[PDB]
Symmetry: C4
Subunit: 501 residues, 4 copies
């Protein structure tokens, strides 16, 4: 077959493809650019390249841990399970090197992804090739075959000891697969959606901890490699501590201890570096370790300063309220009422509701405000018998207000400018020469003055912690010009009060 593997090479339809391209037709035009780019070409957003590069991450983390251990702590390991492990690993890192000449390269300077196989070839050779070519081919296994052709007797003389010390240096060229480890994680963590939705301070602090553990692991093997290459001199940490003929569990464990002590800021065990090699390795690990630890405090600080923001923003605003009250020296009763205001108005979290609504689409501002005001719509007798466009056009105009008990919301004998809807609590309409009356959750007041452009006719005073909704004059005249049929309903209720008045 030739069809079913072409579906893996071209970017399929999911959420990511849509996000990258817009409509589904833009993906369908992209899926035809893959097939028209030549035979057997890989698109980088496709499902093959995502699940190929996932298996290479599970192979590099295998070979960046097992390789620097099996070179040092085993003084001769050329058994069958080890060489097969290196040949199988060298197979995938050649196939990965082959498939990089067929993968499209994302250019951050144009809107196109290059799928011409020659332009892919000329960009890969210039930027990351030799680091991915040295780490691909088995360099150590070539050199033993080449030195076999150079000299047949290179296994008997005193040169043979130098070659084996030269061989383990060449097999550390396979640690250049960190360059493919780093690139295939930055490309993975953006595409993978659960890491794309995490905060960037959480993502970078995981990449650091994965790097601090890996550098401490390589350093732990390097504290044992450099004395081992020097045939364990009589001043090296390994000799004095008498760790030449222990198991490879302890050697590595003690070496990891020394590296972690040098890095994490602790002091080594009274073995003041006494040999030049040891002094310069410890000074290497002290500088490397204290730099990675100071970058760990930098990420941990940036993570903490973006944990709990709204509350921070509520308290930073209220601290400016507190210092404003002491600058003008308010009485402590008015300081108590203003502190009773913010925890009843804002309830501990301060959002900027105007911008959060305004960035959204209209069809979503109509949906949120129709959800936030369901306790007002279902309780009022006005809104259950109205046009649903009228209800949505009303609720977008309102603004939320809080009045403490004892406050005069409307003073009689002023010019009216707002209309009030009662969400919570009861108020007291105080009438000149008549009995006071209460209004409940769902009654509305402040409409007589807006229909006549006159002055206020009665006092309104809060009794509970009333949470009201305000409607200005300019919005009230604008809504009725759209819907003149709902104008007469307010004229009916305003006829009733002026009757009672």
């Amino acid at each position: 077959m030739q069809r079913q593997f072409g579906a893996m090479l071209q970017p399929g339809v999911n959420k990511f493809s849509l996000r990258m391209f817009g409509s589904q037709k833009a993906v369908e035009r992209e899926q035809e650019r893959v097939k028209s780019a030549g035979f057997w070409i890989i698109h980088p957003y496709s499902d093959f390249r995502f699940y190929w590069d996932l298996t290479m991450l599970l192979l590099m983390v295998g070979n960046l841990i097992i390789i620097p251990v099996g070179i040092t702590f085993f003084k001769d390991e050329n058994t069958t399970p080890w060489i097969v492990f290196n040949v199988v690993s060298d197979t995938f890192f050649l196939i990965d090197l082959v498939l990089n000449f067929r993968t499209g390269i994302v250019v951050e300077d144009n809107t196109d992804i290059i799928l011409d196989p020659r332009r892919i070839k000329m960009k890969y050779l210039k930027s990351w090739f030799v680091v991915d070519f040295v780490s691909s081919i088995p360099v150590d296994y070539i050199f033993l075959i080449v030195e076999t052709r150079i000299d047949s007797e290179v296994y008997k003389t005193a040169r043979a000891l130098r070659i084996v010390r030269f061989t383990k240096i060449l097999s550390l060229l396979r640690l250049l697969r960190l360059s493919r480890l780093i690139r295939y994680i930055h490309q993975w963590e953006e595409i993978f959606h659960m890491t794309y939705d995490l905060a960037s301070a959480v993502v970078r602090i995981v990449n650091l901890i994965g790097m601090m553990l890996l550098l401490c692991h390589w350093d732990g093997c390097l504290q044992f490699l450099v004395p081992m290459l020097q045939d364990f001199p009589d001043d090296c940490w390994v000799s004095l501590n008498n760790m030449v003929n222990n198991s490879w569990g302890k050697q590595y464990s003690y070496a990891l201890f020394k590296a972690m002590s040098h890095m994490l800021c602790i002091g080594y065990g009274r073995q003041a570096p006494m040999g030049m090699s040891d002094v310069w390795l410890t000074m290497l690990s002290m500088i490397v370790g204290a730099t990675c630890y100071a970058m760990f405090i930098g990420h941990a600080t940036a993570l903490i300063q973006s944990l709990d923001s709204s509350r921070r923003q509520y308290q930073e605003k209220y601290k400016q309220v507190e210092q404003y009250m002491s600058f003008h020296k308010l009485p402590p009763d008015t300081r108590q009422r203003i502190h009773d205001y913010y925890e009843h108005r804002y309830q501990g979290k301060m959002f900027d509701e105007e911008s959060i609504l305004g960035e959204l689409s209209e069809p979503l501002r109509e949906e949120i405000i129709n959800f936030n005001c369901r306790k007002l719509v279902a309780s009022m007798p006005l809104f259950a018998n109205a046009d649903p466009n009228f209800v949505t056009s009303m609720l977008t105009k309102l603004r939320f207000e809080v009045f403490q008990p004892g406050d005069y919301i409307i003073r009689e004998g002023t010019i009216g400018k707002k209309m009030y809807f009662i969400q919570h609590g009861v108020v007291s309409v105080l009438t000149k020469g008549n009995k006071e009356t209460k209004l409940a959750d769902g009654s509305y007041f402040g409409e007589i003055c807006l229909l006549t452009r006159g002055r206020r006719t009665a006092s309104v005073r809060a009794d509970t912690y009333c949470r009201l909704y305000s409607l200005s004059v300019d919005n009230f005249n604008e809504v009725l010009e759209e819907y003149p049929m709902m104008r007469r309903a307010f004229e009916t209720v305003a006829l009733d009060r002026l009757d009672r008045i």
Copy 2:
């Protein structure tokens, strides 16, 4: 009786209940949902659940300190005061496990608190049950009864030593009460109002210090437990230091030292971990300790950057003023006057007075501005003989201005746009062809040009550090259309000057 205990199960009336629900009637509807939820059901905001969970915090902090000490440092403690201490403690952690099936669960996805006892049951079993069931029942005391039924002779053989080493591992299942310690502090610190009013950087840094001391205490017992379970091998820190047969005061004290050295970044006393157990415990404590210490620097930095904000905001603004003056290379006399401006205008603290007033309710902006301008109202002869709505409608329009001596506030022969009230100091009305005259604290100028829409008639020049109040034209015409009776008083005073002119 059955009545008086029902008053503890339902949420009573206080500030917290009102804050959570709004009006008192919303609490009264909530108190009937408790009684209609079945027999003997606990509401989580009620006064029983607050003072039950306060006693459990005073019991868990007892049992998360005494239990990890009395297991390790006492090689056999099955006396009467110890077992009674564990049976009494296991009674409350079963009753706490029973009462969790009757407490309402706060859902952060709906507006309702579930009080149906079956839906409480099906949520508690899924999230935090087995951690609260293992830590509830005495697991170690069951296993001795079970092993008694398995083998009657399990106290004489060499298996008996293995069982006692197996017994102390099971009694460390009681350290899972940290999961109930953490949950019952987050629920406590939000309800308790003196911790709800503290900053979140102060709250999280207390929870960290309580956790750093507890982890250092468990680590201090763990440095002694793991050698004790291994029958004190001849390489363990305890042997070399010769601390096998000291008092349990020293054993614990020396162990706490070792843990604090490993954590707080210091180095241990020349005892380079020489036994695998000791190497991996020290490496455990170095990673745990340096992570908690780096999080301590992160909270201490976030606390310091939100200590003194206004002044920070005054100085960050004035540093932008300083660099603006050096960018344009002002003369040093004008740099001196502008530095004399900010400390007389702002006095070292810079508030944003417009937003701090604007977030409040109108009945509070009328109360603050009527307090801030009492020195202006009581000193002017205008305001003591006026309507109190007129005084409040005037004072909401004014804006605060500062003029240094020598400055010309009003130049003669321009178009007038503002009116001035004198709070502090004296000015000099310079008249074309007449003698200069002074105006004092409470006189007002700049009203002749607003009544006639003409041009300026005289010069006004500052003599002291005058703090004035400004009133624009558009506000001045608006206030007089409300109150035309106060229009004639300004016409009387403007008749006097033009007479003197």
Copy 3:
């Protein structure tokens, strides 16, 4: 005399007095409230209390360094120069205790400073009295006189050794003068103007370094005091190190080393605390030292993040410009021109010129803008022959614009909306059917279309990096209604071009 000392008790006239009170008359009313408050009363802002509390800072820093040294490191020092040093010091700390009942107390809840001597007395006894009464009287010298009356033979028995160990504990009550050290620095650093003008991050980091050196000095004496009070046990750091009979230079030096090692995160010299006293002192100093060091990183971070702000603000804005250009994938030539824009428009520092001007007084916006545009005023032939109010009313309207070479500033055949003044460089007026002409620094263009409300008549194209000034139509019509005499001058020049046209 009784007059000349009254001038020290009342707050004199300087910059600070004026800043605290406003006009000089407000100081003169304050100077009469001092004299009318009773006989011999101290005002806290006066020149006596400033220079009294300056000498006490130079005495407390003497006695918080010399006292904790001379108690410990001298096993018996009751010589004449030592006791005279303590009696002279105890004289000033009684007089300072007497003068605190006559100093006015600043209340942060009212606008008044209390000068009633009874209300001063009732506030001082409640808040800071016993800490200033214990540290005032010589407590150790009383106890030797009292024990002389208790038992005449208290110098011969074995009780006499216990009394001398009890005596040095009582003389450490004089370290409560830190409470007067801290209060008299917070009151000093606000009044002293060179510390009031420093940043608060610079002030708090100096108070910390003064506290870290003092805590390390007390800790250095405490590492030697507690073994000295225990008669130097055979496990104490002093014995093992063999420092019992050295000079008091070394004892103190070695002790300061140990304290600094425990605090600054280093490890002590192989002397793992081997005595309970030593373990709990080292654990005391490790917690105290690592807490003060973590607060040092917190202040050093907050200092660095407010060093270089404008440039930070220029680069944080331009980084948003850089990521905006790569998000839309601009060509690299347009990326080069936009990078050439910001360094010619903003020149590396980005100020918010609108708010920095707007917070100032008008008489200062008239003075700065008349300084920033002196190269425009002196070079134009228009402004040197005009009214100085007209020049100031023109320059407040202008806005600053930058055009790169090749740009078309004005395209012929559009509706004109702005007028241009040339500060730097030359432009090319391209005329339909006529020869191009240049305009120099001080010529102006874009006024023909504003006098006729017609359309554009010619093209204008930049040749150099022109820095222009823009004047809108609405401002241009407004200025000419004030000054109609300068309207005809632009009509003359517009007559010339239309002649040449």
Copy 4:
């Protein structure tokens, strides 16, 4: 010749000269102020002073490394290659001292650069002269000639040992060239354009690392100098460690270790400072090292908090969206749609497009918006047949909107206020009593209601993730008054629908 060297003394024409002065003529006036300032005067921005001060940076870094090494670790080095190295170095630091009296001094208080050679002379002597005069002349080589004249026999007695210990103290006066190292880097890093374009957090952290390595290098020589000047006492670190007669490779290496341990927070190798000199040097290096390390954490934190800003700003906004949705307890379907909104509207990066465009010049807003809308212009049939000023005046008015599928963009029977252009996807015009029809990328809807000022005539419902462009009424009436010829084209298309209707 005298001409060709004058071209190096005067500031040439490049980007920096233009940035500092404006137009090229302003440079040409500056190049004549150099020649008119006297004979042979150096302008500080010129190409001679840039490449002179670059060679001195490559000489000071030579002599601040080689000098503190060759003094200490060589107990007598007066060979020919050493003295020639000091005489050649003392030649350039005299010529650099001579050329500082001819270089113009930048004054941060005026707009002029002083080129009068007397005012250059009187400013250099007051600020940085004696530090540049002591470090210039060979002070040690004078003192041997002077002491030769004082006493001819000063080489034989016991005074001769004191003179050689006095000689190495005088040759450390050459470390005052750090004052010329610091000044010539701040002047270099501003002029050099690749360091002027880096962030200031990146620049200051490189200057710190260059200072931390240099202070650790001087400290490493100071740990060996002070015992060497004291003839290696029997308690000094050098003796006990037995490092008196090793090579100068080890001496220096071991000393650098000790300094780095004291600074980087590690502990020294069991050599608890046992000699007063050693105690006070270690305490010197602990305070110096922990201060430079705490400043390293401060810069590393400030670097991390300005790495990835836009995404931070996208996520900090969306976290406020997340907490707003849980505060009002939205259903999880509406939480899913709003999360589908932001990643389709903003695509993970949130720019403030209004301010980023508004700070630019008009000729650049015309160029960017003509680039961002090329997919709209080339696809619509309207824009390919229009005036290019009309296309640019249209595209500056549009605003970008996103509608999810199922949303009703336009509801039939409302008042029309906007016009829509389709960039991506298809919509469904739902017609009362007629068949639905689709519109594609480049068709436009919402123009019938704007030409008649009537109400909406049909429903429009989204089908894909439509990215639209909005055009308001007030902008639509304004553009047609400029171009009435394009008014009739929309009237033609609106005639077609009302025909189909």
